[PDB]
């Protein structure tokens, strides 16, 4: 078993296809996803040609060991795919039709900038390394690229699964490599975040703003310090569900900005008390009255500016 | 070893059966469950036929390699099942009786809408891909479909395990596929949720309502802010045990609604203090007296409306 | 290699023995434990018999493939045991002495009702499926059932390891199955729970009761609300270490009941303040004085009633 | 391939050696550690003897299958070691020199009594089961026992890796076994615990003692209840990093004792307020003045007594 | 298959190269990283030489079994690498060109002293053990050492991947070993830590300092005790993301020092109250006024001293 010889000097074309069966375990922190799919391969090996008159069968079936099979790998995998060959069917001209079902943990990076209103392009890169005897090139058989309707990725919407038909042919360590880009387009189901994180977080912030209708320093301290603690709890929760990015994320920006609002409300509460104690409640009263409008107005504008910057 | 040839042009019928031994590790977040079961297969291979009078033996035992065995797979699995053949028995007419014991991690989605008073239909999809020589169709031998009494799924009640007898026959990548639906019906043991989550949560909410029988702003602030923190703790706990759904769950809606009750009680406590300070405790007194009834009444009605919507 | 033929019509008896080497990873939430043990098997194969005189040897050693070995499995396992054959020794009368060392993750359910003062009977079910040629029955060789002194299960006391000598014969999928019950008796090391959970929990409850020697509503609110929060922390901690049971556990009952004590102390604290403000401190004083005795007395009695119900 | 025959009736001596390459993943809760080491074996097989004069060769290299190799196992492992043979070299006298590199997860119990100032003796027990033909005894070749400089166990200091040269020979299931004790001596790097757990815990306790210089019941309640909550947080953190022991640990004793100090300070704070309200601030003042000395003095003595008991 | 014989007495040179494909799962606590790379090996086997004229081919492809291949291992791995041979090619002179794609979990220690502004040198140690027949020495083919552009390590910047060209040859168990150091230089993406941990932590500390503009003991106690609790929350979060080091880390030291600031502010708040109650608010006033400057000034200087010591 060695590669099929060329009729001229042409490279050997391996037609490929990936059909997704199961898509699961999309880890945001790890920037990985698990995939269970069909991998279909097709090439001509004239040495396998037969007469069905003589052989008695129109199509021959071979075991992987019996014939030459191209060493196909995935670029962006943790470990080599766990594959089980489904069928190897040889037609009288020497055309080999290979099918396997595999499972792999794919490493494809994610862009969390718009999180949790973000979309991703997951990649599955198919590769073949050319042999000394002859050069191997990958092709996309669009008829054999797809996914079933059952394919469900928890907390995501699956938009598309397509292949970039033109392979990336390049030199690596004195040999040729033919790379294929299978792109799985997905968009996050942002719903859950609103009642689970966003609105709870806004409610505690608004609770802190009731200190602007209070003259009790002891109560105001309790209000603004306690809501701040509840915010720290949400911040920790959020940062446990996300990786450490070298950029700011949308949720991250909002969460951070709210700390500034808590900080300024502590300043306001302090200023109001100091003046009241210094026997000038008229100044304290005018600051507190301004705060009642300024805090929500600045909050609303800051958020518009933020949303504008991110989307 | 190749598929048994057809007498006419009829497809080859593979009679199937799944007998559950162990059912375990139902992960709600992952929407997966682990299974340890018997898989029984049966088909007629006329080439394996023999005379019961001439052979002496009425049954012959073969090793997997010795005979043709259909390539049977599960659709909704993480990885291919870990199988170990128990027995292969051939009758004189050439009817093969295959038995294996397997273990697999099954991906079957869950409906959390009524959580924790929800029921699920777990699926195990058996599939066969037809060969070039002849078409393979799956069948259900009801006599070989079951589960043992010992089958225990922690925190669940196992209702039924049945097969949808009519296979889903369809074309995939120019070959026929025969799919079978094995449905495992289960209902959640909601008991634990009442003393662990529901009642603790209601007790803290009721503790917050004691502020309606208090004139002390500083104490009321402490009461409503502290119970709010305790509620956040239960909300986080609950959302760690569940996946992020693009819909509202029952527990989710109740938890969210209680935030609104905390928010309004903070408004009430603030309003009562402001009036008292504005030297109008008569208005404050009538609002607080109304709150005493309104808060429980609106809580009880909102909950009835919620339960009606979910059930 | 086929089963040994019967002299009459008697079933083939396979004498068994499990000798525990390592017992570890008892997961309460998963209701699983890991095991590492010797499995010893013994049966008569007349076909393997020899004369020690002409042969020169009194014992013959064979490789697993060379002779017929019964397909022995465990019922309550996650996946099939990882086994390594240690020795296969044949005596002149054809008596085969098999030994393997295996490791398996066993699913055996637990009764948490008396937790953490509970005891369990872990099970390891050995099974053999009868063949068409002849029926296979299991037996217990008590001389080969045991465990070493080193066998340590973290946080548990190992009481016994015995086998239910009479196998349970039954039909499963038109074949006879011979099942053996190996019972590993263990009792929980409840020590840790006292300084880690029980006493911390009682101390915070007793701290809440100091409000019965205080006339300060603001301080009482702080006391009872804060200790309640600390109780919620212990409740969550406990429920993370345990599975969700469709019944009440001992610790669960105690933990739940303490919620009610906190609720009533909030009512008492509220009632005392209201009366004091309504200018009737004499009534408030008599209620508070009663509470000082009633709270500990009712607590002590409720606990006696609880302990009585559970033990 | 069968065992080498004895010249007399002497047992076969297998000289052993373990050379640690990697020591990692010491799990305190699991009482396990992972290892990566060389296992060296040596025994005389007279059947493999040759003439170095005629053979021209001083050494002959064989593949594992070609020669008899003793079945060596580890007692205290989770699963059987993952091994890969490095070399098999035979000398003219028939002395076999075996070398493999293995990796195993070892179960060796730990003594937490002095935690985190504790030391441990990890064990690796090598074992051989004697065959019917002849008895096998293990030996230690001290020249082939060691570890490299690079061997780093995170948060531990590696003291010594030695073997107990005299094997423990005993009968198990009618056959002889020869056991060897490889002891890995390690001591915990206690540094981290001081700024991470111990000092934070002492600082909160000392903050609670500032209530002895305060007449404000409301403030004292806040001080002692809040520091108590922060102490519960450290207790939970500590008990998550440790297994549940049927004995008291050093850190556990200290952590438990500090609860009693918090409990008594709540009593003191309560007593001081009650007296002040009962219009006897002179008694309250003398109790508070005593508390200022008594609390630190009793704390310091209790700790000396504790440290004395544990070390 | 035995090692190629030496022309003189020279050692056999194995030219090596590692080309990184995937770099992932850098665990700080475990001090491990996962790698997926090409391993290229090259050595002269004169026995494998041929005439390209006679044979007609200028390259010869062999299967691993067909020829002698050096037993190459990694020193700092958990378990032996999962490898799959890509190609084996022989040139007329007998120069073998081996290529495999492997995946391994590498244990390489990290220096947390400057965390999270730290840089690391990850190591991959290639090793070969000399045989009895001849000595094997490793070499670096710089032409075959590299990494692709796609190589992304989450939360890290990949600086370089180079090999220390001169092997560290040494004796281990009377045999020579040739070791190669492949160094992967990386620097931490410290960005995230600033909005996530550093600034939240500074904001709560600054909130505590508002007590220096307050005469209310009850409010000051609430402020400094609450912010202390929020600080403990960040400390625990940080220490969960890091291993226990026998040295102080940068973040660790800052976090520790902030406890001292909280402790002294509690002393200040206590002192101010005591004096006020002792009817000397003039002394209390001058201490509080000094604190307003002293706390930020000492904080800023202590941090300069710290940063100076660490960088
Ligand atoms: C406090 C801040 C609350 C966050 C507000 C939502 C952010 C947003 O406006 O998110 C926007 C995304 C949709 O993004 P897209 O249209 O696909 O992006 C492409 C946009 N271009 C082409 C213009 C660049 O969701 C929505 O439809 C909004 C629904 C969520 C409302 C939650 C409110 C509570
Ligand atoms: C005399 C007062 C009796 C109090 C009984 C409280 C009933 C609680 C029933 C809980 C059912 C589960 C809903 C709970 C609201 C808080 C009750 C506050 C009572 C304040 C008393 C004021 C002085 C007259
Ligand atoms: C009589 C006034 C009714 C007040 C109702 C307030 C509803 C606010 C709705 C917010 C929805 C988001 C928004 C933030 C508002 C801060 C809380 C309002 C305090 C009002 C106290 C008034 C004392 C006289
Ligand atoms: C505040 C929270 C209040 C508790 C919510 C109770 C939810 C509920 O009432 O849940 C209802 C469940 C759902 O089960 P179902 O019978 O199949 O309903 C479907 C009915 N259809 C087919 C007609 C639409 O009924 C139970 O088993 C009752 C459990 C009672 C637990 C009460 C705990 C207190
Ligand atoms: C004179 C006061 C003696 C202090 C005794 C403390 C008893 C603790 C017993 C522990 C039992 C376990 C049992 C919880 C009750 C809290 C004690 C309240 C303090 C009373 C202040 C009285 C002011 C005159
Ligand atoms: C609130 C405080 C909770 C105290 C719980 C005590 C548990 C108990 O009372 O009993 C737990 C077990 C009972 O085990 P058993 O022998 O099976 O009892 C059934 C026997 N009959 C059938 C004969 C009646 O005994 C023990 O370990 C007692 C020591 C634990 C004391 C811990 C005190 C704190
Ligand atoms: C809160 C109170 C915290 C007390 C912590 C000190 C514990 C102690 O005293 O620990 C003692 C350990 C003992 O370790 P050993 O020398 O191996 O035992 C040998 C014992 N013989 C002679 C009985 C065999 O000494 C150390 O190295 C710890 C020194 C660091 C002190 C950290 C202080 C904070
Ligand atoms: C008029 C006072 C404005 C004070 C603004 C505070 C500076 C904020 C700098 C933010 C840095 C990020 C150093 C933190 C302490 C802040 C305390 C301020 C108390 C204000 C009371 C003034 C009474 C007249
Ligand atoms: C002037 C006060 C200096 C601060 C004293 C605390 C130093 C602690 C050093 C611990 C070393 C180990 C140690 C016990 C500390 C109790 C703190 C109470 C301080 C109360 C101030 C009252 C002002 C009238
Ligand atoms: C609390 C205060 C936060 C302290 C943060 C440490 C800053 C620092 O100075 O960090 C130091 C490191 C750089 O160190 P280096 O490049 O490895 O060596 C430098 C070469 N020397 C050793 C010869 C001098 O990064 C920075 O410039 C971090 C910039 C972000 C600052 C954080 C803002 C808040
Ligand atoms: O035969 C299979 O494995 C899968 C079929 C499918 O997803 O339709
Ligand atoms: O023989 C078995 O593997 C299983 C039997 C059972 O579940 O009864
Ligand atoms: O594996 C063995 O030979 C022995 C184990 C034991 O005695 O526990
Ligand atoms: O050859 C090896 O596998 C290891 C060598 C070492 O630790 O020195
Ligand atoms: O052929 C490969 O396995 C890898 C290629 C790559 O990383 O470019
Ligand atoms: Cl392939
Ligand atoms: Cl792959
Ligand atoms: Cl099959
Ligand atoms: Cl499958
Ligand atoms: Cl077996
Ligand atoms: Cl098994
Ligand atoms: Cl071995
Ligand atoms: Cl082993
Ligand atoms: Cl190799
Ligand atoms: Cl390796
Ligand atoms: Cl040397
Ligand atoms: Cl050498
Ligand atoms: Na092939
Ligand atoms: Na077959
Ligand atoms: Na308060
Ligand atoms: Na056999
Ligand atoms: Na061998
Ligand atoms: Na080889």
CATH number of residue D170's parent domain:
2.70.170.10
Q: CA-CA-CA-CA torsion for D83, D87, D91, D93, nearest 10 degrees?
A: 10
- Smallest CA-to-CA distance from B10 within B37, B46, B62 is with B46
D77 alpha carbon, closest ligand: 23
> A256 C-alpha to center of ligand 30: Å?
27
Token output for C49: 């018999």
Query: Between the CA of residue E46 and those of E5, E13, E67, E93, E139, what are the distances in Å?
Result: 8, 13, 12, 7, 19
- Beta-strand (E) ranges in E174-226? 175-188
* Count of domains observed in chain D: 2
| Nearest-CA distance E7 → chain A (Å) | 29
D155: left (phi over 0), alpha (psi -120 to 50) or beta: left
**Nearest CB partner across the interface for E34, out of A73, A78, A243:** A78
**C125 and C230 both lie in a single domain:** no
Sequence-distant (6+) residues with CB within 8 A of B54 are none
Ligand 3 binding pocket includes B164 (Cβ within 6 Å): no
The DSSP 8-state label assigned to residue E75 in this structure reads S
Could you tell me which residues are beta bridge partners of residue E104?
E35
CA distance A62 to A58: 13
E215 close to D (CB below 8 A): no
Which of E:20-39 have CB within 8 Å of D? 30-31
CA distance E276 to C287: 36
A62 alpha carbon, closest ligand: 28
CA distance C192 to A309: 54
CA triple E125-E126-E130, angle to 5 deg:
130
| Nearest-CA distance B233 → chain C (Å) | 9
C6 close to B (CB below 8 A): no
Q: How crowded is residue A148: how many other Cβ atoms within 10 Å of its Cβ?
A: 14
User: Under a CB-based contact definition with an 8 Å cutoff, are residues B20 and B149 in contact?
Assistant: no
Q: Which chain B residues are closer than 8 Å to A193 by Cβ? A: 244
**C130 and C20 both lie in a single domain:** yes
Q: Could you give the 3-state DSSP secondary structure of residue E77?
A: strand
User: Under a CB-based contact definition with an 8 Å cutoff, are residues B116 and B194 in contact?
Assistant: no
Could you tell me which residues are beta bridge partners of residue A41?
A16, A98
Element at E204 (helix H, strand E): helix E199-208
CA distance D273 to A163: 77
B86 close to A (CB below 8 A): no
Q: How far is CA D220 from the centre of its chain?
A: 43
What are the pocket residues of ligand 8 if the criterion is a CB atom closer than 6 Å to any ligand atom?
A 267, 270-271, 274; E 206, 209-210, 213, 296
**A198 and A184 both lie in a single domain:** no
CA distance A272 to E287: 22
Query: Between the CA of residue E216 and those of B164, C235, D218, what are the distances in Å?
Result: 74, 35, 12
CA distance C157 to C189: 7
CA distance D180 to D163: 7
Instruction: Taking the CA atoms of E166, E168, E171 and E172 in sequence, report the sign of the dihedral they define.
Output: negative
Which of D:131-160 have CB within 8 Å of C? 131-133
Measured from the CA of C207, which atom of ligand 5 is nearest?
Answer: 16
The DSSP 8-state label assigned to residue C149 in this structure reads T
User: Under a CB-based contact definition with an 8 Å cutoff, are residues D283 and C226 in contact?
Assistant: no
Residue of the CA atom closest to atom 7 of ligand 8: A267
Label residue C37 exposed, middle or buried (CB < 10 Å: 0-12, 13-18, 19+).
Answer: buried
Compute the half-sphere exposure of residue C138: CA atoms within 13 Å on the CB side of its CA: 34
**Among C177, C192, C207, residue at a domain's last position:** C192
Residue indicated by tokens 């302090």: A270
β pairing state of E146-147 and E12-27? parallel
| Nearest-CA distance A235 → chain E (Å) | 8
**B37 and B121 both lie in a single domain:** yes
- Smallest CA-to-CA distance from E295 within E195, E229, E197, E227 is with E227
CA distance B226 to B207: 10
| Nearest-CA distance E53 → chain D (Å) | 36
B213 close to C (CB below 8 A): yes
User: Under a CB-based contact definition with an 8 Å cutoff, are residues E249 and E309 in contact?
Assistant: no
Q: Could you give the 3-state DSSP secondary structure of residue B172?
A: strand
> B102 C-alpha to center of ligand 13: Å?
30
CA distance E117 to E250: 9
User: Under a CB-based contact definition with an 8 Å cutoff, are residues C98 and C47 in contact?
Assistant: no
**D158 and D209 both lie in a single domain:** no
User: Under a CB-based contact definition with an 8 Å cutoff, are residues B153 and B179 in contact?
Assistant: no
Sequence-distant (6+) residues with CB within 8 A of D28 are D110, D112, D241, D242, D243
> Which chain A residue has the Cα nearest residue E35?
A78
C151 alpha carbon, closest ligand: 13
User: Under a CB-based contact definition with an 8 Å cutoff, are residues E53 and E266 in contact?
Assistant: no
CA triple E206-E212-E216, angle to 5 deg:
115
User: Under a CB-based contact definition with an 8 Å cutoff, are residues D172 and D214 in contact?
Assistant: no
Label residue D287 exposed, middle or buried (CB < 10 Å: 0-12, 13-18, 19+).
Answer: middle
**B131 and B22 both lie in a single domain:** yes
Sequence-distant (6+) residues with CB within 8 A of D150 are D21, E75, E76
Q: Could you give the 3-state DSSP secondary structure of residue E99?
A: strand
User: Under a CB-based contact definition with an 8 Å cutoff, are residues D119 and D66 in contact?
Assistant: no
**E163 and E265 both lie in a single domain:** no
Please name the chains neighbouring C, where neighbouring means 3+ C-beta pairs under 8 angstroms: B, D
D25: left (phi over 0), alpha (psi -120 to 50) or beta: left
User: Under a CB-based contact definition with an 8 Å cutoff, are residues B228 and A204 in contact?
Assistant: yes
Which of A:53-72 have CB within 8 Å of E? 71
CA distance E101 to A172: 13
**C248 and C186 both lie in a single domain:** no
Residue indicated by tokens 């279909």: A40
Ligand 3 binding pocket includes B274 (Cβ within 6 Å): yes
Q: CA-CA-CA-CA torsion for E70, E71, E77, E80, nearest 10 degrees?
A: 120
Q: How crowded is residue B138: how many other Cβ atoms within 10 Å of its Cβ?
A: 22
Ligand 2 binding pocket includes C287 (Cβ within 6 Å): no
E33: left (phi over 0), alpha (psi -120 to 50) or beta: beta
Could you tell me the CATH number of the domain that includes residue C216? 1.20.58.390
CA distance E125 to E180: 5
Q: How crowded is residue E103: how many other Cβ atoms within 10 Å of its Cβ?
A: 19
Query: Between the CA of residue A93 and those of A69, A89, E107, E123, what are the distances in Å?
Result: 17, 12, 52, 52
User: Under a CB-based contact definition with an 8 Å cutoff, are residues A73 and E83 in contact?
Assistant: no
- Smallest CA-to-CA distance from C77 within C188, C182, C176, C216 is with C182
User: Under a CB-based contact definition with an 8 Å cutoff, are residues B274 and B143 in contact?
Assistant: no
Q: Could you give the 3-state DSSP secondary structure of residue B265?
A: helix
CA distance D135 to D130: 5
CA distance B186 to C92: 55
> B231 C-alpha to center of ligand 17: Å?
47
User: Under a CB-based contact definition with an 8 Å cutoff, are residues B164 and B179 in contact?
Assistant: no
Q: Could you give the 3-state DSSP secondary structure of residue D38?
A: strand
- The experimental method is X-ray
A263 close to E (CB below 8 A): yes
Crossing angle, helix E217-240 and helix D199-208, to 10 degrees? 170
- Beta-strand (E) ranges in B5-148? 12-27, 32-44, 60-61, 72-74, 82-90, 95-107, 119-129, 136-140, 146-147
Sequence-distant (6+) residues with CB within 8 A of E166 are none
CA distance E127 to E138: 8
**D44 and D148 both lie in a single domain:** yes
Q: Resolution in Å, one decimal, please.
A: 2.7
Buried b / exposed e along A77-88 (16+ C-beta atoms within 10 A): bbbbbeeeebbb
Q: Which chain D residues are closer than 8 Å to C223 by Cβ? A: 221, 225
φ, ψ (nearest 5 deg) of residue E261: -60, -40
- Smallest CA-to-CA distance from D72 within D40, D94, D95 is with D40
**A180 and A43 both lie in a single domain:** yes
**Among E145, E167, E192, residue at a domain's last position:** E192
Buried b / exposed e along D21-46 (16+ C-beta atoms within 10 A): bbbbbbebebbbbbbbbbbbbbbbbe
List helix spans (H) across chain D.
Answer: 52-55, 193, 199-208, 217-240, 250-277, 281-310
Token output for C143: 């001389």
Measured from the CA of A202, which atom of ligand 1 is nearest?
Answer: 1
CA distance C89 to C100: 12
Q: Is the peptide bond before B116 cis (omega within 30 degrees of 0)?
A: yes
List helix spans (H) across D79-198.
Answer: 193
**C42 and C125 both lie in a single domain:** yes
B187 close to C (CB below 8 A): no
Q: How many residues does chain C have?
A: 311
Task: Tell me the residue range of the domain where A125 lies.
Answer: 1-192
**Among A162, A192, A222, residue at a domain's last position:** A192
Provide the terminal-to-terminal Cα distance of chain D, rounded to the nearest Å.
56
Token output for D90: 């035979």
List helix spans (H) across A113-216.
Answer: 193, 199-208
Residues with C-beta atoms within 5 A of ion ligand 23: D 73-74, 80-81
CA distance D36 to D82: 9
Label residue E199 exposed, middle or buried (CB < 10 Å: 0-12, 13-18, 19+).
Answer: middle
User: Under a CB-based contact definition with an 8 Å cutoff, are residues E54 and E80 in contact?
Assistant: no
**D187 and D199 both lie in a single domain:** no
Sequence-distant (6+) residues with CB within 8 A of C2 are B61, C68, C133
Element at A87 (helix H, strand E): strand A82-90
CA distance E17 to E168: 16
The DSSP 8-state label assigned to residue E160 in this structure reads E
Query: Between the CA of residue C296 and those of C212, C292, D166, D262, D270, what are the distances in Å?
Result: 11, 7, 62, 20, 17
User: Under a CB-based contact definition with an 8 Å cutoff, are residues C219 and C206 in contact?
Assistant: no
SS (H, E, C) E14-28: EEEEEEEEEEEEEEC
- Smallest CA-to-CA distance from E188 within A245, A28, D192 is with A245
Token output for B279: 């030297």
Buried b / exposed e along B63-100 (16+ C-beta atoms within 10 A): eeeebebbebbbbbbbebbeeeebbbbbbbebbbbbbb
Crossing angle, helix C217-240 and helix D217-240, to 10 degrees? 10
């Amino acid at each position: 078993v060695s590669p099929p010889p060329p009729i001229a000097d042409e490279p050997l074309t391996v037609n490929t296809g990936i059909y997704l069966i199961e898509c699961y375990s999309l880890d945001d922190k790890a920037e990985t996803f698990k995939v269970n799919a069909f991998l279909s391969l097709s090439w001509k090996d004239r040495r396998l040609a037969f007469d069905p008159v003589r052989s008695g069968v129109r199509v021959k079936t071979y075991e992987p060991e019996a014939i030459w099979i191209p060493e196909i790998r995935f670029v962006n995998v943790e470990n080599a795919r766990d594959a089980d060959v489904v069928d190897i069917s040889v037609s009288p001209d020497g055309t080999v039709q290979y099918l396997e079902r595999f499972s792999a943990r794919v490493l494809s990076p994610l862009d969390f900038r718009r999180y949790p209103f973000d979309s991703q392009t997951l990649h599955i890169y198919l590769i073949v390394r050319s042999v000394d005897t002859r050069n191997i090139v990958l092709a996309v058989d669009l008829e054999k690229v797809g996914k079933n309707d059952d394919v469900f990725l928890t907390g995501w919407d699956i938009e598309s699964f397509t292949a970039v038909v033109k392979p990336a042919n390049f030199a690596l360590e004195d040999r040729l490599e033919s790379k294929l880009d299978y792109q799985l387009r997905i968009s996050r189901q942002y719903f859950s975040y609103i009642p689970n994180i966003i609105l709870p977080m806004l409610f505690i912030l608004f609770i802190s703003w009731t200190a602007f209708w209070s003259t009790s320093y002891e109560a105001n301290v309790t209000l603004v310090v306690s809501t701040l603690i509840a915010h720290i709890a949400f911040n920790i929760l959020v940062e446990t569900n996300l990786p450490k990015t070298p950029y700011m994320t949308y949720t991250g920006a909002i969460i951070f900005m709210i700390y500034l609002f808590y900080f300024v409300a502590v300043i306001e509460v302090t200023v109001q008390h100091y003046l009241k104690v210094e026997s000038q409640p008229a100044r304290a009263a005018s600051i507190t009255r301004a705060s009642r409008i300024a805090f929500p107005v600045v909050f609303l504008l800051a958020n518009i500016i933020l949303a504008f910057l991110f989307f």
